[PDB]
Short mmCIF file of C-alpha atoms and ligand atoms in Angstrom, two decimals:
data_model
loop_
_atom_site.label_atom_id
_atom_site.label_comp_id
_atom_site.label_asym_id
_atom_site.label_seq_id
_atom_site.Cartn_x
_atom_site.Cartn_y
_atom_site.Cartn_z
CA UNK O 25 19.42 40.38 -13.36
CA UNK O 26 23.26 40.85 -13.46
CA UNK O 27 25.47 43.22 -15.86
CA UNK O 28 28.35 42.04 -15.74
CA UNK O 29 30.44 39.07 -15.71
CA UNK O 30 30.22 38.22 -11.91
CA UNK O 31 32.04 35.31 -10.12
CA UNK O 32 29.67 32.52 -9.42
CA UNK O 33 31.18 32.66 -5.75
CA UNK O 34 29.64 36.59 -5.42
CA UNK O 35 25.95 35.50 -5.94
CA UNK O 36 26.15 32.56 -4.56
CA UNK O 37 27.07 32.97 -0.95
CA UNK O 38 26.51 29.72 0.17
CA UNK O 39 29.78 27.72 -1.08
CA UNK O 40 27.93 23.76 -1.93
CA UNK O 41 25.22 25.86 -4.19
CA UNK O 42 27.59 27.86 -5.68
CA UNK O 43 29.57 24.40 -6.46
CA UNK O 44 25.88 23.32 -7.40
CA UNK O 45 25.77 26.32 -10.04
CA UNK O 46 29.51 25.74 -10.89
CA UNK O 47 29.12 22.40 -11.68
CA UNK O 48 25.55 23.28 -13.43
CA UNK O 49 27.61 25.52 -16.16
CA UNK O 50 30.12 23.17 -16.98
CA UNK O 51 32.77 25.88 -14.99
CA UNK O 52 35.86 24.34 -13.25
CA UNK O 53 35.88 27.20 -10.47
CA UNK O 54 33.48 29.15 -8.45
CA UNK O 55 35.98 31.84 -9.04
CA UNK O 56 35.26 31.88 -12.91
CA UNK O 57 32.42 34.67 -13.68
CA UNK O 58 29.30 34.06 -15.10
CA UNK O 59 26.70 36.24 -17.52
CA UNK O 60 23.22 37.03 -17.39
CA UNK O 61 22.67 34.99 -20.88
CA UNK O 62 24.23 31.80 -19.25
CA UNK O 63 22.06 32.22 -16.15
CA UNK O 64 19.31 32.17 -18.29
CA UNK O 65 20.97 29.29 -19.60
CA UNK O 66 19.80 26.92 -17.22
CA UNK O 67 16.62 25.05 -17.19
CA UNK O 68 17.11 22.64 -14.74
CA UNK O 69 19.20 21.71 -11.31
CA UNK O 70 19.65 18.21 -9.98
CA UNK O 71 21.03 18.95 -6.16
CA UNK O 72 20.29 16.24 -4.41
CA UNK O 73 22.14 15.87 -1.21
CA UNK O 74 24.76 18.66 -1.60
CA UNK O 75 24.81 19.93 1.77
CA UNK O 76 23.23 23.40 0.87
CA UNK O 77 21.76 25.36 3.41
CA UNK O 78 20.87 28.54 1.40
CA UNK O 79 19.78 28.95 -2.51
CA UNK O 80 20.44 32.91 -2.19
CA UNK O 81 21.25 33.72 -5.87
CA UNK O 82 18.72 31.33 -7.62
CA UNK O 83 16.64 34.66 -7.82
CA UNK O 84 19.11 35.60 -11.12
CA UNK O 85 17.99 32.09 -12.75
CA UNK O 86 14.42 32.60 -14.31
CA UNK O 87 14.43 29.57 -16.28
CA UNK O 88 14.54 26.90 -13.78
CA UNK O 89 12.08 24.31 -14.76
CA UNK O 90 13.03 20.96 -13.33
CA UNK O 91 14.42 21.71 -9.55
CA UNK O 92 15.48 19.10 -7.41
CA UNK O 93 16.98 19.96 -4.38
CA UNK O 94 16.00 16.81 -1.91
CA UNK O 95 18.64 16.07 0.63
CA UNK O 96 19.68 19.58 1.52
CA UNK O 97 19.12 21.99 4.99
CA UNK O 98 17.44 24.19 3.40
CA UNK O 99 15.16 25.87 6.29
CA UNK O 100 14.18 28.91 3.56
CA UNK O 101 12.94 29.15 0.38
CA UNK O 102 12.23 32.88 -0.22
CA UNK O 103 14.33 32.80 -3.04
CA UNK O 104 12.28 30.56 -4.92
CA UNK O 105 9.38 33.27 -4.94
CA UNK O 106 8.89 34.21 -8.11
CA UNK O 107 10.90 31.20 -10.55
CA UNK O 108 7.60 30.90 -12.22
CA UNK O 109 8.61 28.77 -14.62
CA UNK O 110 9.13 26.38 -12.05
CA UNK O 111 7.04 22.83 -13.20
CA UNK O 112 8.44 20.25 -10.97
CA UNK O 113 10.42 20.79 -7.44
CA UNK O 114 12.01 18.89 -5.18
CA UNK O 115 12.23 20.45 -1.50
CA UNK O 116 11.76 16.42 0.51
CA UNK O 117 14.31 15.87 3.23
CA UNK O 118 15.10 18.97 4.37
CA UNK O 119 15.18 21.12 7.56
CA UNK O 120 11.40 23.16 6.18
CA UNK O 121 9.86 23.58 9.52
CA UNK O 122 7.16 26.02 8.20
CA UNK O 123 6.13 28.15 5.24
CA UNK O 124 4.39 31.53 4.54
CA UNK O 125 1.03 31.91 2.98
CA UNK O 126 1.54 33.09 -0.37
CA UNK O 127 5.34 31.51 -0.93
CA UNK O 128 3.76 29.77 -4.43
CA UNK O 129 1.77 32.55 -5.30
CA UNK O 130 4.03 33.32 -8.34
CA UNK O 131 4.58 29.53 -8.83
CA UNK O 132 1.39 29.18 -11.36
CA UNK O 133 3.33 26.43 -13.73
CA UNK O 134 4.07 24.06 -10.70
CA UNK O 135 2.57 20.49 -11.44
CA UNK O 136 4.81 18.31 -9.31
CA UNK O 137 5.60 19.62 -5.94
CA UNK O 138 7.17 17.24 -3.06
CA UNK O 139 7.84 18.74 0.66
CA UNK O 140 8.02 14.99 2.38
CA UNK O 141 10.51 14.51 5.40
CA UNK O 142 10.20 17.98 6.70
CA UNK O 143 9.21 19.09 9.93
CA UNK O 144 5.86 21.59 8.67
CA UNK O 145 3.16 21.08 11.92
CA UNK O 146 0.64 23.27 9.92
CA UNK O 147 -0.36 25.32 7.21
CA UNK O 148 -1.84 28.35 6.31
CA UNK O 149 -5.51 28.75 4.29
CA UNK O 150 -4.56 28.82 0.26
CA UNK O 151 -0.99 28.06 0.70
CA UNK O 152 -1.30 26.51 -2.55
CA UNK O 153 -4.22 28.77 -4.38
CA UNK O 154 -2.94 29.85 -7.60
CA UNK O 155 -1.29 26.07 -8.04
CA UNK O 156 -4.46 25.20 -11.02
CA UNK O 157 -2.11 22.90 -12.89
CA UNK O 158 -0.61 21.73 -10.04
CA UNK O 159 -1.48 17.43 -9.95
CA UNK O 160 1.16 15.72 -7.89
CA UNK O 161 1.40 16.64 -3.96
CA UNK O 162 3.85 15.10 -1.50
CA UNK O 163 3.63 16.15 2.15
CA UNK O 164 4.45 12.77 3.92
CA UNK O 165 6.84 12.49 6.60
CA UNK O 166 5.93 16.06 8.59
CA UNK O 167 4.65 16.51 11.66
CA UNK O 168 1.13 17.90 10.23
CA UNK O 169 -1.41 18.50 13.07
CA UNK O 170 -3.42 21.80 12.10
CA UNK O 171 -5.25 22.16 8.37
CA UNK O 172 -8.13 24.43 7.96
CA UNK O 173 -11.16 23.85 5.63
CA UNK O 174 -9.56 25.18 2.94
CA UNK O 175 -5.58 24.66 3.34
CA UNK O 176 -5.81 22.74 -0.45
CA UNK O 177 -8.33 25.37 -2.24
CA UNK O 178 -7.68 25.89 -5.66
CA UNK O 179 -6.36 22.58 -6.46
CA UNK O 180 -8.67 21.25 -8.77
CA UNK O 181 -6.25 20.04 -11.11
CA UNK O 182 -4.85 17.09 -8.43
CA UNK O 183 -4.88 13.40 -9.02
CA UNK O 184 -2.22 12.46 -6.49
CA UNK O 185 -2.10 13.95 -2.63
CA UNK O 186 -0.06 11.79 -0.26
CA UNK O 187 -0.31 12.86 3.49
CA UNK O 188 1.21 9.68 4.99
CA UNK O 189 3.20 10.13 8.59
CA UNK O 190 1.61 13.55 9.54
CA UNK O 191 -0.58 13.59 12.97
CA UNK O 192 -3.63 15.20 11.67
CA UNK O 193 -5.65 12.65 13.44
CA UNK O 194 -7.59 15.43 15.95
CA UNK O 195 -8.65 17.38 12.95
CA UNK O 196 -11.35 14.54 12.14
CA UNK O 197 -12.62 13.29 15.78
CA UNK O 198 -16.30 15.23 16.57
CA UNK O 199 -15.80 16.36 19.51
CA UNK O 200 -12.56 18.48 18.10
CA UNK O 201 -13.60 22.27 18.68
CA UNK O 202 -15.81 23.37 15.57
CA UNK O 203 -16.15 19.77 14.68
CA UNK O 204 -13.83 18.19 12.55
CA UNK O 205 -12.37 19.77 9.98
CA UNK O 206 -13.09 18.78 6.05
CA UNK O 207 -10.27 19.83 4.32
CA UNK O 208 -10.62 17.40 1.06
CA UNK O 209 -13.42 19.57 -0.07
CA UNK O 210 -13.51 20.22 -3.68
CA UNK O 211 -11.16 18.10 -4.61
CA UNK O 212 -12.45 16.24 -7.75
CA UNK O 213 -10.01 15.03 -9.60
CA UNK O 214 -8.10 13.22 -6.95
CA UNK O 215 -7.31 10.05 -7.92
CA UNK O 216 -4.88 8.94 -4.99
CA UNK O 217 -5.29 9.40 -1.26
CA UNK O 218 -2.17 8.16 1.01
CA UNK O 219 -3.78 9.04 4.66
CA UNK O 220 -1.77 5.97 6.33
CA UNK O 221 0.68 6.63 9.61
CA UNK O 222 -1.50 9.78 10.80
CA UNK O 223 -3.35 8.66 14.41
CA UNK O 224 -6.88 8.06 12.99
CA UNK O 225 -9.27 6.65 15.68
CA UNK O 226 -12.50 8.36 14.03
CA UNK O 227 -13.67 9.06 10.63
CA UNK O 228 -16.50 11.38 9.82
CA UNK O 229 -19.19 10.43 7.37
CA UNK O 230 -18.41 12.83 4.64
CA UNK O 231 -15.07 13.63 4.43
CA UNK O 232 -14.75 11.98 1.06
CA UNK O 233 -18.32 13.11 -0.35
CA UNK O 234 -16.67 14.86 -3.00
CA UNK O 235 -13.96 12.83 -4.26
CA UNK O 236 -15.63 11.55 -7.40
CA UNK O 237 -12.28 10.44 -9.17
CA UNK O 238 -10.60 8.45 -6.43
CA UNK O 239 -9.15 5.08 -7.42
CA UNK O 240 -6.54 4.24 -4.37
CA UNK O 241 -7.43 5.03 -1.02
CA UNK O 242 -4.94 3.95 1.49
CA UNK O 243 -5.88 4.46 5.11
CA UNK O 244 -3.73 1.87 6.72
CA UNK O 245 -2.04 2.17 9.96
CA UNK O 246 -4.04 4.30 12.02
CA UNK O 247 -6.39 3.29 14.64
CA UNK O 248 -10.10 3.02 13.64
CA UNK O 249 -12.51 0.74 15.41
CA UNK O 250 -15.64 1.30 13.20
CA UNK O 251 -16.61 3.39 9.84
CA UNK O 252 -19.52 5.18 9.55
CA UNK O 253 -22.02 4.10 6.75
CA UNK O 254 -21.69 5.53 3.72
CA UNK O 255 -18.16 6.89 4.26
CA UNK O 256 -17.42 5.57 0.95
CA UNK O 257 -20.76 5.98 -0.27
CA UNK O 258 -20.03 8.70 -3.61
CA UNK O 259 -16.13 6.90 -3.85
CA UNK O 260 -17.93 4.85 -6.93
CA UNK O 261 -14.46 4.74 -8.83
CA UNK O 262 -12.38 3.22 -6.55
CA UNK O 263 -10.38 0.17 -7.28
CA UNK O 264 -8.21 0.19 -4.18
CA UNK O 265 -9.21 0.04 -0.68
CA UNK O 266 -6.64 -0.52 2.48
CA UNK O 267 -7.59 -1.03 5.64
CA UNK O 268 -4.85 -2.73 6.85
CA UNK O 269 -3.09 -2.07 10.11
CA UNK O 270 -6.39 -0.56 12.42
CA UNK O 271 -8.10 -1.96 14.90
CA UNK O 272 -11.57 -2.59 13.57
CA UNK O 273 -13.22 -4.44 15.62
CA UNK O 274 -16.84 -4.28 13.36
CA UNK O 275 -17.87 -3.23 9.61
CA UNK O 276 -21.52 -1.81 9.22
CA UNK O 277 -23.41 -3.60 6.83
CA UNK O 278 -22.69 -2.18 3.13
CA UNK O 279 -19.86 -0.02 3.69
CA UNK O 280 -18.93 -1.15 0.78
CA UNK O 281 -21.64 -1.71 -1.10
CA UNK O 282 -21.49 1.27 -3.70
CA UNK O 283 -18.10 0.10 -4.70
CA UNK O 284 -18.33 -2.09 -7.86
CA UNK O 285 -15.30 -1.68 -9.43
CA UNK O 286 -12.96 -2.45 -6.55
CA UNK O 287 -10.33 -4.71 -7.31
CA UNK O 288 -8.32 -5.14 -4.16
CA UNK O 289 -9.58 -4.77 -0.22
CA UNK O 290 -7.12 -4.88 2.45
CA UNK O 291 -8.61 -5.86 5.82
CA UNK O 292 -5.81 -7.17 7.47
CA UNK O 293 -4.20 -6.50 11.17
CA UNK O 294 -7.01 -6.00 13.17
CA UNK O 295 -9.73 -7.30 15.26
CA UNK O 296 -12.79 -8.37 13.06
CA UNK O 297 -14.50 -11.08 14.87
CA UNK O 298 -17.17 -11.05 12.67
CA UNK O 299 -18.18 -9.68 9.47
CA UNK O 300 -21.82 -8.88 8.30
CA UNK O 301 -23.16 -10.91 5.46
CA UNK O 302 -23.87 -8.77 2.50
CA UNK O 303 -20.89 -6.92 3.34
CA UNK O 304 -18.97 -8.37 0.11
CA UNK O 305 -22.22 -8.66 -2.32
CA UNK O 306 -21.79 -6.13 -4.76
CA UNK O 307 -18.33 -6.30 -4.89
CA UNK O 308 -18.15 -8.11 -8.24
CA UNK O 309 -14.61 -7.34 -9.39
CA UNK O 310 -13.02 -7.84 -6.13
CA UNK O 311 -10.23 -10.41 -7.30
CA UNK O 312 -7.86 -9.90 -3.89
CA UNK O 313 -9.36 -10.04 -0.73
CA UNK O 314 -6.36 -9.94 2.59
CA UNK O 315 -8.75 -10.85 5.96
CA UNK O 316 -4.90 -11.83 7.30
CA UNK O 317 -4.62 -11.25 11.36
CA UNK O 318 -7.95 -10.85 12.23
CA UNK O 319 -10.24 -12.89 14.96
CA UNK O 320 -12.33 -14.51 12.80
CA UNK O 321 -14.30 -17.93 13.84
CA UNK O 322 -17.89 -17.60 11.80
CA UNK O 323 -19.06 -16.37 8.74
CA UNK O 324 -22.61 -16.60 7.36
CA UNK O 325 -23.37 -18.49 4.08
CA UNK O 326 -22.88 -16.22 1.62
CA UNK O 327 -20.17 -13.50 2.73
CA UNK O 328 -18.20 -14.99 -0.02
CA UNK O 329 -20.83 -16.25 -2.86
CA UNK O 330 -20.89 -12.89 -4.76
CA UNK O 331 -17.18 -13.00 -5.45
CA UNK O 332 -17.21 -15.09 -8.48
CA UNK O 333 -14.25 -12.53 -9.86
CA UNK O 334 -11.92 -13.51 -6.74
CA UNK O 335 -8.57 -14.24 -7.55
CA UNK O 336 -6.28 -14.47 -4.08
CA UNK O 337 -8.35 -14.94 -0.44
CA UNK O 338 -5.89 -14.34 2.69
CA UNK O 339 -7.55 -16.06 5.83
CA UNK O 340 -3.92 -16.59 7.15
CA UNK O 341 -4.31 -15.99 11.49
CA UNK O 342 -7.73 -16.33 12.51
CA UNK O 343 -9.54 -18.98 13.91
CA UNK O 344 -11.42 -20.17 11.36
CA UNK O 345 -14.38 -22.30 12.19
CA UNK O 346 -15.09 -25.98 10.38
CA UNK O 347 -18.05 -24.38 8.93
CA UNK O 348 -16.09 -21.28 7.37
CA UNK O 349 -14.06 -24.00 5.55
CA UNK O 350 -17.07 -25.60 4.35
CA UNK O 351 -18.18 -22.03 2.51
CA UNK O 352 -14.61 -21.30 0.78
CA UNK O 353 -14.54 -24.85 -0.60
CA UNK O 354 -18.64 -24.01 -1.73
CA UNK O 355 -16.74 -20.57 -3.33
CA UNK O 356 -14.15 -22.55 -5.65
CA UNK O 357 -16.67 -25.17 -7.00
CA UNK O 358 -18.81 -22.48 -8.49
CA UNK O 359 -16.02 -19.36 -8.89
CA UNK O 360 -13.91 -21.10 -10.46
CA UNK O 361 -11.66 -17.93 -10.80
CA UNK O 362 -9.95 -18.42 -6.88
CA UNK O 363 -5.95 -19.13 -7.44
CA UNK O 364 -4.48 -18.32 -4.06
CA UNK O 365 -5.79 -19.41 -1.05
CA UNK O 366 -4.08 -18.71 2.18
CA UNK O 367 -5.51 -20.65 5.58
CA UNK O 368 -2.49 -20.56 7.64
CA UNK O 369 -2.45 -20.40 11.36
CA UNK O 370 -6.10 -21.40 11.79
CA UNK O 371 -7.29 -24.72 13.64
CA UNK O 372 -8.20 -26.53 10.27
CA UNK O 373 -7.41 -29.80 11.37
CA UNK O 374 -8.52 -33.15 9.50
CA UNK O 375 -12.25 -31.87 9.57
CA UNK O 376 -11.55 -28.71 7.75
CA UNK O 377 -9.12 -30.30 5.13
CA UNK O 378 -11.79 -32.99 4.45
CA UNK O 379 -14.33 -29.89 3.61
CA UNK O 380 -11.14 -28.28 1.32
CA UNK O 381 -10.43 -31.64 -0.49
CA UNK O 382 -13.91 -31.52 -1.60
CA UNK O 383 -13.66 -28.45 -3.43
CA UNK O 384 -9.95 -29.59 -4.85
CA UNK O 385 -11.37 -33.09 -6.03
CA UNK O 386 -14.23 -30.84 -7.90
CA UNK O 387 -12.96 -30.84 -11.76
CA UNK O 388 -13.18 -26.83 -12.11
CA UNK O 389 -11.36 -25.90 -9.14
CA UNK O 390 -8.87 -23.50 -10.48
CA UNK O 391 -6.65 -23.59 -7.23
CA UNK O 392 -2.66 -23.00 -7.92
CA UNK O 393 -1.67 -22.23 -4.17
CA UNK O 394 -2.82 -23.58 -0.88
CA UNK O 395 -1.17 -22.94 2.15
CA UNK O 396 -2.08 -24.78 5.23
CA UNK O 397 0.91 -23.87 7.25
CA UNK O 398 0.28 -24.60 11.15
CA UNK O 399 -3.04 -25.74 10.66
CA UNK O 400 -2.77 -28.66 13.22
CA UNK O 401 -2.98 -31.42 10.58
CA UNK O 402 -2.33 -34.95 11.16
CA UNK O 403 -1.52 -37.75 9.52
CA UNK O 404 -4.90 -38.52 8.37
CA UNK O 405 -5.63 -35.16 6.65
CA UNK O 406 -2.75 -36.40 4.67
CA UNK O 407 -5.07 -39.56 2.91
CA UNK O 408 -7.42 -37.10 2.04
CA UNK O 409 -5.02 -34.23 0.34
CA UNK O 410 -3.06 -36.83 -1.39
CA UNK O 411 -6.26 -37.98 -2.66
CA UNK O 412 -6.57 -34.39 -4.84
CA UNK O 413 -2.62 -34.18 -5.54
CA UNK O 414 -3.20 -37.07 -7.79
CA UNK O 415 -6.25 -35.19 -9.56
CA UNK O 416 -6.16 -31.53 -9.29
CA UNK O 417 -4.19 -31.03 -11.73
CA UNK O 418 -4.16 -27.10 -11.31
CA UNK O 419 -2.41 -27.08 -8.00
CA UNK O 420 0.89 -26.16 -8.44
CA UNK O 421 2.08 -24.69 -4.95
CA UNK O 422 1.41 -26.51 -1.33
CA UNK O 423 2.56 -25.17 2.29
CA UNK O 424 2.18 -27.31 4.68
CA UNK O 425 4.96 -26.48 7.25
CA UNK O 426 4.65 -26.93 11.20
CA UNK O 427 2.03 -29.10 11.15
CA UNK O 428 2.16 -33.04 12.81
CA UNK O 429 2.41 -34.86 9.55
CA UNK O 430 4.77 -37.53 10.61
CA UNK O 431 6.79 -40.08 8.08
CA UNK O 432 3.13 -42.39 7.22
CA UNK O 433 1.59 -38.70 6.46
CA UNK O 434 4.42 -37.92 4.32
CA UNK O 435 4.57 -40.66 2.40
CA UNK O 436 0.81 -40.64 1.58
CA UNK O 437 2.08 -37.47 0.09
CA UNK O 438 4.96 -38.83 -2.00
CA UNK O 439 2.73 -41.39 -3.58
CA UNK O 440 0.67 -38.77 -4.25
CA UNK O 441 3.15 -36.35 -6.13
CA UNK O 442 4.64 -39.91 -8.05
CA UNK O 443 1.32 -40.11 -9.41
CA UNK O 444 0.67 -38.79 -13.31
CA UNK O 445 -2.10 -35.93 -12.48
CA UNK O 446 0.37 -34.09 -10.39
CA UNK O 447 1.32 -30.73 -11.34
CA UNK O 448 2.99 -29.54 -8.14
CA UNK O 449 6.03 -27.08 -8.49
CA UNK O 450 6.14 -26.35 -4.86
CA UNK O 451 6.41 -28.79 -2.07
CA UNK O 452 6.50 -27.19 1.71
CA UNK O 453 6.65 -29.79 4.74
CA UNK O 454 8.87 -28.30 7.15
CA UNK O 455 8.53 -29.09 10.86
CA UNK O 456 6.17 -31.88 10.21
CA UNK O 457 7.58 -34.56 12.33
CA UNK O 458 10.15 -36.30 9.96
CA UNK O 459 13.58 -37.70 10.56
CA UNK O 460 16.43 -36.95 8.13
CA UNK O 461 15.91 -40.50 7.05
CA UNK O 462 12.58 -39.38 6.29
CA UNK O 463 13.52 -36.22 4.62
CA UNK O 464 16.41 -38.31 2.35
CA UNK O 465 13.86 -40.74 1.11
CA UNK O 466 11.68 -38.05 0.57
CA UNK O 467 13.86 -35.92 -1.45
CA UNK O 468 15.06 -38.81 -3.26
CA UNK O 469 11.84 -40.40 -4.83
CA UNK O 470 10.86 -36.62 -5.78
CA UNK O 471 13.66 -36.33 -8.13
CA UNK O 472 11.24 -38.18 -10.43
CA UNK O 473 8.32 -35.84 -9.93
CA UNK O 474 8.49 -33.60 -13.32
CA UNK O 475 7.05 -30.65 -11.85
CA UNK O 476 8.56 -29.77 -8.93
CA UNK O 477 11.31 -26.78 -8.63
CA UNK O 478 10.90 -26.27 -5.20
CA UNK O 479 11.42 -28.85 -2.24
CA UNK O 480 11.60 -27.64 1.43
CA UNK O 481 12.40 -30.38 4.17
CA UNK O 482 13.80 -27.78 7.09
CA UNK O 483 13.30 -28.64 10.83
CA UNK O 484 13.12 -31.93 10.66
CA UNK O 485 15.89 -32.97 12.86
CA UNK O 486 16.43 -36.75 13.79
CA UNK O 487 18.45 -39.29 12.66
CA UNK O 488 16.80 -42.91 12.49
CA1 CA K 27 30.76 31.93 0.32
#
């Protein structure tokens, strides 16, 4: 508390938060005084970026509700102690390189609280205790290596905890001394995990036991080869799953299978050669599926027949054998539900588009979007897609870019999109053999085609 009119400047020592509180009260100096009623005046600060090192003097605001002060250098945050009125704060992108037990022990109205971009490499036990409304958590972007059990006790009010870009990866490998540590106890409300960017190469069973309420668990970009079973087993909520970005190189059979309502599984960027079947069969609202860079070849009958629900399937880089093509085409005749479907960079060849015209000549095929980019067509595969551009009427998007079509593969293609059944908005044959000639004609006689918006003709360089 102050007494008496005071100069902004005198409890303010640092000279870009004093401009901060300046500017806060409407004052045109730092030099013009302030009173203990106008102090308490202030409900909220919006400092972002303001080149304060030091918010000495904030003590004599106990209002502050709404404080954002991300962009600063602040290192401290003492002054902060006992603001309890304090709901939502702002301390990401600063110069925090650590912080004492006990620093939000007066803080017991805090429900959004980000400290990403810092430089915190641990944490005390109950650094965040008395935080009970507390929901939102940001600690992304530190340098995180050293959690205890019980680091996030007393949280049981949190639906969002992002950890993203820390290094906590030792704290969950077996072998680390005490075994690894299983600090996400308790935490039963939590909706959102962000894990991604730590160096994850194992995963204990049971670090997720309790998290009844998740919905969105990210664990991309770290480097797992294998899951345990049943490390989702209790996750029953969930909806999102990434993978992404590991390098699994197997799945145990029914890893997923206690996961009903997810919506969206991202397996893509790593090295799944193969994948057990039964590993998608109770996965009944799965409507994406993203099996993008991978080393896939075979698949039994039947990794796909469950997912009647699927929406968009990413196959794009594998090698995908004839037979794999075969089961996706089985998929859309009786699904009926799959829209996007993304082959590239597989040897399809004429074989394999044979086996997907099948599906696409089936009246109930529901396909919008194929894309067989690089998938070492020829000219002939060309007969045999044309054949379903006249019919499939639902198709409205084709990629077929750096593949050997050639001019007599093209045209099969124009005749194709001429024809009254065809719907196509999106036409993609770039590198495919053609001369400019080619591509004139080409672009020409599809001026006529009623659907199409969107022509691309690129790298196809000869004239004549
Ligand atoms: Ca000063």
């Amino acid at each position: 508390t102050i007494t008496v009119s005071t100069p902004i400047k005198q409890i303010f020592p640092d000279d870009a938060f004093a401009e901060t509180i300046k500017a806060n009260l409407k004052k045109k100096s730092v030099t013009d005084a302030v009173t203990q009623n106008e102090l308490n005046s202030i409900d909220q600060i919006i400092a972002n970026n303001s080149d304060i090192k030091s918010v000495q003097g904030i003590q004599y605001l106990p209002n502050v509700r709404y404080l954002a002060l991300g962009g600063n250098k602040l290192h401290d945050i003492s002054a902060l102690k006992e603001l309890t009125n304090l709901g939502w704060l702002n301390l990401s992108n600063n110069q925090l390189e650590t912080l004492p037990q006990g620093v939000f022990e007066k803080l017991t109205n805090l429900t959004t609280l980000n400290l990403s971009n810092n430089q915190l490499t641990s944490l005390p036990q109950g650094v965040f205790e008395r935080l009970a409304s507390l929901t939102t958590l940001n600690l992304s972007n530190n340098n995180l290596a050293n959690l205890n059990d019980r680091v996030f006790e007393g949280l049981t009010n949190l639906t969002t905890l992002n950890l993203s870009n820390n290094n906590l990866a030792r704290l969950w490998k077996h072998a680390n001394p005490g075994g690894p540590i299983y600090f996400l106890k308790g935490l039963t409300n939590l909706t959102t995990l962000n894990l991604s960017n730590n160096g994850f190469d194992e995963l204990p069973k049971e670090v997720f036991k309790d998290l009844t309420s998740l919905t969105t668990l990210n664990l991309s970009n770290n480097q797992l080869t294998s899951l345990p079973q049943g490390v989702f087993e209790r996750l029953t909520n969930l909806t999102t799953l990434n993978l992404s970005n590991n390098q699994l190189t197997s799945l145990p059979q029914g890893v997923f299978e206690r996961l009903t309502n997810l919506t969206t599984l991202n397996l893509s960027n790593n090295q799944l050669t193969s994948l057990p079947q039964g590993v998608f069969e109770r996965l009944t609202s799965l409507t994406t599926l993203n099996l993008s860079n991978n080393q896939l070849t075979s698949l039994p009958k039947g990794v796909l027949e469950r997912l009647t629900n699927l929406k968009t399937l990413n196959l794009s880089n594998n090698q995908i054998t004839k037979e794999v093509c075969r089961h996706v085409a089985e998929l859309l005749k009786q699904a009926a539900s799959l829209h996007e479907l993304h082959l590239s960079n597989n040897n399809i060849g004429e074989e394999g588009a044979a086996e997907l015209v099948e599906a696409l000549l089936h009246p109930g095929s529901t396909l919008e979007t194929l894309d067989l980019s690089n998938c070492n067509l020829t000219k002939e595969a060309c007969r045999e897609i044309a054949r379903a551009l006249k019919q499939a009427t639902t198709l409205h998007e084709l990629h077929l870019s750096n593949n050997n079509i050639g001019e007599e593969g093209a045209a099969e293609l124009v005749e194709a999109l001429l024809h009254p059944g065809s719907t196509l908005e999106t036409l993609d044959l770039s590198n495919c053999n053609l001369t400019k000639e080619a591509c004139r004609e080409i672009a020409r006689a599809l001026k006529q085609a009623t659907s199409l918006h969107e022509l691309h003709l690129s790298n196809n360089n000869i004239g004549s």
